[PDB]
Amino acid sequence: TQAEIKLCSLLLQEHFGEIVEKIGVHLIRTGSQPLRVIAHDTGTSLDQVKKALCVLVQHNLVSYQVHKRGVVEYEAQCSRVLRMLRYPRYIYTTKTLYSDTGELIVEELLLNGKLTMSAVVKKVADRLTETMEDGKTMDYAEVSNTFVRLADTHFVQRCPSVPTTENSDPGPPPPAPTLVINEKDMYLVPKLSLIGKGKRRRSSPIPDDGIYWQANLDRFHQHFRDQAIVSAVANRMDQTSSEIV
Amino acid sequence: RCPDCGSTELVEDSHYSQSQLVCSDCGCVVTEGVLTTTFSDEGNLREVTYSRSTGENEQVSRSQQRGLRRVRDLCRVLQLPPTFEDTAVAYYQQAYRHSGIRAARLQKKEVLVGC
Amino acid sequence: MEVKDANSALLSNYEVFQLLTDLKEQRKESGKNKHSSGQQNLNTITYETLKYISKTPCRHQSPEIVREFLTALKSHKLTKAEKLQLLNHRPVTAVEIQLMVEESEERLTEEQIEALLHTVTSIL
Amino acid sequence: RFGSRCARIFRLVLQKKHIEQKQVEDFAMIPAKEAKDMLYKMLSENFMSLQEIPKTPDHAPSRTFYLYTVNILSAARMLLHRCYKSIANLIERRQFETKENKRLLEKSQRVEAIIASMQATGAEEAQLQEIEEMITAPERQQLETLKRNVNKLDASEIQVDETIFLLESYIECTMKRQ
Amino acid sequence: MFVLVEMVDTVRIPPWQFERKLNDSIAEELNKKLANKVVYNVGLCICLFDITKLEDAYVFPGDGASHTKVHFRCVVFHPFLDEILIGKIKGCSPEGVHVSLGFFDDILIPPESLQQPAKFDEAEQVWVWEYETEEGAHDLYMDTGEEIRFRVVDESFVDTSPTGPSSKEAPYTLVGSISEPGLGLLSWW
Amino acid sequence: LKPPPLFPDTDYKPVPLKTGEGEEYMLALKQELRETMKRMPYFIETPEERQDIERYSKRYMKVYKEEWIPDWRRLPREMMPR
Amino acid sequence: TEGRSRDGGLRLGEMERDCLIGYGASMLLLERLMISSDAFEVDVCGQCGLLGYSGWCHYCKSSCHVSSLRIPYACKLLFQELQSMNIIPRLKLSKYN
Amino acid sequence: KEQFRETDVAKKISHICFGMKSPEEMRQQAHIQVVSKNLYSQDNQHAPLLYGVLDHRMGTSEKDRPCETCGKNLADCLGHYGYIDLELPCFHVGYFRA
Amino acid sequence: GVSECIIMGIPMNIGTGLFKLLHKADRDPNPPKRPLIFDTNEFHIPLVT
Amino acid sequence: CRKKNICHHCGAFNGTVKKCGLLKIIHEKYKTNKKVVDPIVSNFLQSFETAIEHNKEVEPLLGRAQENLNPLVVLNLFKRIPAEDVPLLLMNPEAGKPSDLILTRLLVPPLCIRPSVVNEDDLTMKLTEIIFLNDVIKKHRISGAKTQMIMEDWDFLQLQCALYINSELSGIPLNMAPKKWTRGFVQRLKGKQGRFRGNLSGKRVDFSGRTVISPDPNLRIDEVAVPVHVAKILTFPEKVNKANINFLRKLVQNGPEVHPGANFIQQRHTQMKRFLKYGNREKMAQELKYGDIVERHLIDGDVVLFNRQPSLHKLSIMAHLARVKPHRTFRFNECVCTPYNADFDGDEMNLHLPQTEEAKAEALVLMGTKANLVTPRNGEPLIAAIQDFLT
Amino acid sequence: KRITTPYMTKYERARVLGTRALQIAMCAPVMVELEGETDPLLIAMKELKARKIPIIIRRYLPDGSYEDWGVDELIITD
């Protein structure tokens, strides 16, 4: 797995930078371990390690697990670091299946790693303002419509959430919040009615608080597998037969 | 040349046991001490011919090796010194260089060994 | 050899002059031993720096007059770099003051510039 | 990488689960002294795995049959390794090209910024040609050569990922992860 | 331009020295060793400023000398950018004017730094000046001249370490600027 | 005697690349992506260091930005950036 | 050498070595066994931990991390053989303080 | 006036770290690739071949022939390594049990 | 150990090789520091508010 | 671990691994069992019908078909072990990686450690044979002959490569076993003549002598008498200083012939010696500067060691203060027979002259006779009167 | 406080004498008047008898701490 480790180093360098590359490669090299020994091994200021870990878990690159004796363990999966290479393909097929608004939704989602519906639709609208001119405007209505359509069709899948504090383990909090994933609401979008006209760079509170989302990588892998199968069928006999398959 | 004097009067000389090179002009040492073999490894000494050590005597054809064997036996039955044998095999090995000598019938080669 | 700090502090040419002078008091006090060329290296660089410093405006200054000057210059809110440069050059006209000070036209007005020029010319 | 005739033999060995060279030459229309070396090449490269049933329990080479065998799952794994190194080497070369040309890139970018600056402020037009007088202009075609090289490396990367998807798709599906 | 830097080193005091008080011997040895030489990150060394602290003076087996570790401070020439300087000329060149501070000489004024009006000479290496109304393209810079005013604008370290198995330019260079008014020859202002 | 040159020649050559408007758009999207990774907090560079002097310009050109914090209920209470 | 027709030289056998560890005379048996027999000097690259030549480490293509040493020849010979048998004695060195 | 360099590099051994050499490093250490089976030149000079074994780029052992890689005579040449590549990989006796 | 010291050419670690010697040189550790006049804290304050 | 037989990670069964032949390894996945026949082995068994049809001897021994281990397969296997696992295998990932354990390249050692005349060392003849055989395989395979030889030829190379490292292997079959013995690497490390026992721990030294011993009862128990002829060979390099300058001048003027004389000088700065025989002058005497070293003869009072070869206890070797006397044998006072256990019936004893001021101090203080009148075994005296003094 | 023994062991004496003799072979100043002897080690022995050798012994405990003892304040003996 040494070539793979080289890919990890390269893509960490290209995505995040030196210190992030260093921490990520060392962790994928040594396995799940507690923070203090990572800081010792790296020898850098624990502030850097802390910030890098926060950024990595924000993008879901690394994962932390509560462990015996109350220590917290930090771990990474090699497969996950082999995916940004596919993000162009993801965006292409989504633009193929959805208008540019869905493309922007997915772009923002992957670039941020985790985000809620209100802020993603707002940021999409804001970043779209420069795609139409001459007094043209847009509301959050169409962006919400595209988002709910995407979520319904499973491309968008909800992130894990915390257990409720006043319900479970009242008192001082544990070392880590031990997030839990819920399946029934994976495609259940929360509700809002706010609309706002985007600001055209003139240079002159959350209803869905805590409901984060992340793209469904498995759906994309399945969809790509389907396209490959159809392509095999189309070449095998005929366009009609592939349209059948 | 003496590094201290430039004069070229170096004489090879030895003290009671040390072998050394001394500028006789000024009394200076420029080199001394030697590394030599011993008697302990002398008994283990082998030898390899330069032909064996340089890639020859494997290309000798069946007929060429038979011919040189004939040279050996014909010279030895006449009770000549080994010098005669070695000169004869050297001559014939040189003679075999000629294309018109190597490509020939057996009896002509026999009389060539005779001569 | 190892370096602990590369930018520990700046220096005034007056301090370097004082170090060279107190070296010179130590110099030629006894017969030169001619031990090695390092004597030549040290003597050359020191004598060259002396002869250079001999043609600078900072001569004949003293620790206390410099300290009083800097105390006076404290209130003007210049940078320590500008303060050092002022001390080292002892300017005499306004045109160079338009040069050394960053944003000289915007940070100061003419009367402040003239007051500074007065201060440098008079105190030194 | 090895010509149609080579794929002609490889597939033959796949469909004939157990075979030997003389059969291959007979059944693959291959001349003598042309197949043998090729099978050795496939065997050396480990795309072909020799199984080697014996004639005697000592498994001596003089007492065995050279029956060939394919292990598709192992085969895929080495290609994955190949592709991994391949993308690695492309990435490095692109970085190597970028860092060597960075000096001319920034020299161009600063003057492009200068040209693009103060354009809306209404400044005089006596800068478009004057800026262009420098050595950058007869190096723009070299910058374009750079850019197409980068583009063309990237296109190569892109196509490799499309392969990766299928190779990975199999090694996943072929495994049960129990 | 002068800067003060902290250092550490080990000094061998050969045994015939033992009479003289140690501190003096270390000071002399360090001045001997480091004076009038240039470091790859802090410039050109002048002399030590003071000695802060001294460890114990060991004697290692097989040798008579005593080895001591020293913490000491040394004043180094390390001008920072945009410093105003005054310095004699030392020679003209097509690529610029060489300037000398007496103890140091690797200062170049490139023609881009020179005032716009003057671009080249009458095939004579002595650089000339030009200006609009007065000074009808007849002033010129003597190879020594006075201590012209100029401001540093660039600098570099270049390594000179040996390369390959064993068996002339200075490793430090500065670039100055003359364009701004009030610089150059004092007679101009 | 002479060993072969480091690059022995090969008869086969890599097959021509596939090109098209979709492929061009993939290439451009990949480039654009590379650009995006340089303009948000997650691009952790080394903190700025080693100022030379008290340059007066420091007042104006200083980069100003808000401190990045993730929502803290999703992470351990151990690594506050303050 | 050892012979009598060849010029000789006597032996500090393993029994004599041990007698001098009887006395605890540390500098004598450094002198007898190294200074007078096969003293030698070599160059080791601290960065890669294995020996080079002429203050130039062919392994690293650099000269900034080489340092000399004094080591008996027969021990230098041992490091050659082991490195030839693909058992590498990467040696790490530090200041003598 | 030249770049200062320290003069005394003297040091002391503190550890021996045993280990292994892989093919890449084994090539990287070596100077040359021995490729010829032969020992000496055909002519009466008996000079060793330029890319056979005994190539004096690998040091020297005769009092008259200095080394090629470093221009030193026998008394001073530390020695240098060459390498030979195997066609079929083969096991190492020492580690077979491993 | 003793054996490793012998073959490496360094003095063994027992007997006369168990302690360190210093020289009783006449010296003054941490002598008076040279006062510097221009760079003192009270004459420098940051401009930034 | 050995107890398990299913890889939990992928449910993959694995059989026993065992050495099938000399330097040959086999794995036992496709093994028949007395219990229910494994489906996998049945599928493996049933696939040989084609060869069974072509050749009849396949049928009798189709049950012996297992997975043979060849360098190629182990190499391409080890290369794929994942990083997280290595340290559990106890080999430190900073020392190496399993993939490199199997070798594919070798270093040829420098010419220093194998001199010209052994004609050449056996390591050289071994190496030239390895390359020769390697060249044979590559041309032979390119020549496209039958498979059988290609692999057989590779086994002999495998054995020869093995034989290069070490030359003791006993499993070699009859018709290729070496007819003559050879020095492999371990043979020159191991053995009583090996590096460790012959060249590192105990080794040959210079500045030493050897001669018969005879009696002299007019020496103090701590002095030893040395012949003039051995005092003229041995030297001590006395450095010049303010106190011994005048003395060393008289020694220089005598040259290397009259006894209290000298043999060399080494100048303080220009390190070339100056052999006093050809000095042409005494003027070197005047030119003696502080820092020069004179290699003077041995003179009365120098500390010299004294040893008798079958050393049994620490009193076998002891320091003595020399005196120079005219005859041809060493002499010492008979009270000191009992430590050395010498008897003047034709014995011999060695002598060494320590070359360093540090070594003189230790020899005198620690190893002197005066400090060793009593044996450390139980404290009884050993240096006392012997026969003919008791009477 | 100092814990270790107050006598000077034979090993400390050997090493002190040897090092001082090496420092006298090199032209270091001699702290005692000399009658005319030349051999450095005899001068070293006279200095020791006079208690004028300028050396300090640093005794090391196996833990890591140490003690400084002057050569003039150990009880030298026969």
Ligand SMILES: [Mg+2]
């Ligand atoms: Mg007897």
Ligand SMILES: [Zn+2]
């Ligand atoms: Zn001479």
Ligand SMILES: [Zn+2]
């Ligand atoms: Zn190195």
Ligand SMILES: [Zn+2]
């Ligand atoms: Zn060499």
Ligand SMILES: [Zn+2]
């Ligand atoms: Zn598994």
